[PDB]
């Protein structure tokens, strides 16, 4: 009762005034809906009968003490070890549904075809999903994971054969969002902004890897109700190695293939293979440290029809430049002092400025579904750095984040 | 057809620039980076065998520690040819093709075929038990297979267990190893050619050196059940001891540091 | 062992001779595959948490004693009573996988929108699926059902408000097939033939309803490898009432709405609503007793491409005439003696001859998938009897049986 | 736009040609076809009420048995207007609108509003128990609600059960019905207008005739717990008995066959 009393009293304490709409939004934020939302759910798609049991499972618990929630998934297939831990938890914190908290203990096998290997995560994390009143979101995290690489089946590389061990990566991120977008899937006249800056191993945050990854974003839109809706886009990113103990100068072990940016595909830069635009090694796509991006868009509305059902046109011209961090300086297995790595990135960013990076181009057919965004484009990569695996056919794009 | 320009492939990152470029073929073995610079022998016998073989074939190379996931097959000791194109590399060579890359792998009389089954199937077990199962040697297994793995006590307990379990099922036995080293000691006392029948040591001497050496270096701890470090030097009249020293004057004729 | 020994010995008892291919086909017919087919399967898509449990279920058992099989389905939704009996059974009979047998105890709610009501079947049957060696199939059945009508929600009719009771209908069918068709979904140069003649209530076959429904079929194809593939089609049908006790003359109660043919839809006669071409009552589609059908087809192959992937064109001109059985003769609630009903159908077939029945026409885009057949036609009904609910847009057709 | 010809809608089948065409409105009630031809009263009281009402309103119609699934609502006794277009029919009239299709449904003093709750809520129960629950009357329920349903002993046991269960929960009680018929008997002995206060019988007399009649015809079987057939004729000085006979001289002034 007090859960709602604490928000009723600020309304009750005061021609006529309409301050109750904010209370209604507060109520709706709890994901507990005034009739009901639901109670628990379930499923067990339990196959059987052979060397595989396939042991499906699911669960939701939409309340425990009044506002706390849980979840669970599983697939004890009998071929994969398990995904038996994908359980979560949620609870507001001392009064409001904004300052959420959470705990998860994930375990999965994130298969990667573009780099011919696999990953075996067995970690757990802890979030704090504070949503500021104006729409600006925040977050935190602390995700000690295990991050094993064991899928080197075909001829992969002599690079992805140097990264097959393990790691801890006790990270601590900090998300952000300033979403003024008019339609989350179809940016027509809105806005955007993000930041995902995490500090992986340093001082108290222990483990083995050590860096500070700093990914930024931007967006735009400007219809000059003719849905002309000129587009936009921009991204950035930096992967700066760091020492391991409570300092800023000293040893610094360079990046692995688990922590580097990969820039390409139907979701980030249209007109390239799912992983392209990188310091490629033969056939295998090794990621680079520093990178940038870009885009321009048109999103023409179907003429002689009007601002009807979401479907529109699209005329994009992407970009992208994912360099890697070389040293080529002061020539000890892997130990670069702060002076060297600094003069590495400082020079490994000059390669970003010079040169026409890359330029896809084409047309597409957007279908701004409420929950997703289907693209089905067709593009033609103009400029390329040798061995980046351009693509030219039908560029089937599906997801939530695009450029 | 359309892509307009071509712009000088993009300079592989610092890790692979430092590790896997090389000039000579970089054999991968189980080892600690302290020995990698010095080319000293490995600590896993299933790889020291091939390493001793190659270095008998007078082929030069650089050892480079790895982690047994990075391998074309499950087993580790695979060799990589040098880098000929800074963006494209040759194919790996598994353990089966190193000595393809004469007298070493030659047919032997069936007697010499027999005793080799003793070493592969009996001495191998006494190694696992004395290392992966005997709790007194929970210290040395740590400094070798888990300590340079991840360095986080939350993780080490996982790998240390994953090994012991997956190694216990693959194997009391201490007696079967006792008499076995007296058998080979007799096979040596009847050769009179400083090796097991041949003037230049072949695949059998190297297969035995794979165990006669490690058990001397890492298992000679005196604290019943006399450790295998003494059995190797006490079997017969010590003919297994002197064999290694006569062997460790050809493969590495310039290194000292044996004998604990 | 003897299961295979009895078919091995006729091969073993005999340049070279190749009589083993027939044995391989016999082995394959068992649906037991030489490596394996499978063992049991399962699922429980069990929702929960509200007034509905939704209680999904499934099961397969691909062997019990060596060749016998079973099945089960269920949905104890908590809104519908249940579908909790949809279980089957199968077993070869004394030597061969041809002379199959079966038992099922179905229970479902076959909803009918075109006639605004529902059906509640709770019956059980018994088959004998003899497959003759030449490809000609046979069958039998004995399906005592319950067949209740209880869905009269909206304004339905004063016709479907005269048929709301119950029935037994202890039928006994006899299927058939002479399938020479080259591709089961895409008839290019093959053939077809069928017959579904059942005797519902008479003599020993007891119950309440009494008739003898006799549905025939035909087909054709003739490519004049240019896949021109001229089409064909034809059907028939007769619903002849019969007395109830061990005789041929006497009482005869006329047809109900549960036992009458309905001729229309995207699966039978393209170019009409899912139920059309009938003795319509206002908005509700009451079926008729006697009927016929027809079709002609073109199935043009995509020119300048060749006999490539199954997709082809289609140019059809259907037909159809579903009359009902009136009496208008010798004018006792519902009791027509054999003399009258005979002179009814004998005259209720004259209405079939006279008059241009109906003629759809259009184009389509066939996609002869291996398991189904997608149509997505577009048709334009030329001739009509008033109030038959023609259709003109996109005629989306999916299924296995078409014209 | 295109359909070229129009060809005389297709002559509805024989069943609907024979049953639901008619000329007069065909009221649906619970009845046996033997009575349908003669317009005799139903056997379910919840419908005989409305039937007596309509036939008091001097409206003519034809009764026609149905099965309580064929109804716009759950309850059966709905009236259908005649057929005006051989392919399209008017809408049904539920039980609430028949007397819309004066003095019948008029406001009564609250006293007359009170006793009606007695009949609707007490006499109704004694009917269910004496019919749907008392095993001695498992015979008469059979000949009415299951025997003309499907006529297959495998089915009859299902419906017969579905009724008894769905009727048992809707309701010992025999005493509450005993005194109730002495109450109304007093309400009649004080009216002196051959009815319950009014010169022309209204909705109350018809609501009571709905039970005073059936319990006489189908429940007067003598074999304690004297059946309700005698209570109705013995309550007071038999004023409930004579009321029906004075009632059954207006609704059906030309039919004999009452009194068992």
Numbering used by the authors:
A (entry chain B), C (entry chain D): 59 to 72, 82 to 100, 132 to 322, 330 to 436, 441 to 512
B (entry chain A), D (entry chain C): 26 to 126, 143 to 212, 238 to 262, 264 to 289, 292, 297 to 333
Sentences from the paper on this structure:
Sam50 forms a 16-stranded β-barrel which is minimally closed between strands β1 and β16. The structures of Sam35 and Sam37 reveal that they each adopt a GST-like fold, which is also completely different from the BAM lipoproteins.
Among the dimer conformations, substantial differences were observed for the Sam50 β-barrel. However, in dimers 2 and 3, the β-barrel is open, allowing for association of strands β1 in an antiparallel arrangement, extending the β-sheet across two Sam50 β-barrels. A morph of Sam50 structures from dimers 1 and 3 shows how strands β1–β4 undergo an approximate 45° rotation, opening the β-barrel between strands β1 and β16 to create space for precursor protein to bind. In Sam50, the barrel diameter by the POTRA domain stays constant while the upper ¾ region of strands β1–β4 can flip outward. All of the dimers appear to be non-physiological, with an up-down association of SAM complexes not anticipated from functional studies. Our structures illustrate how Sam50 can open sufficiently at the lateral gate to accommodate precursor binding at strand β1, positioning L6 at the lateral gate through its interaction(s) with strand β16.
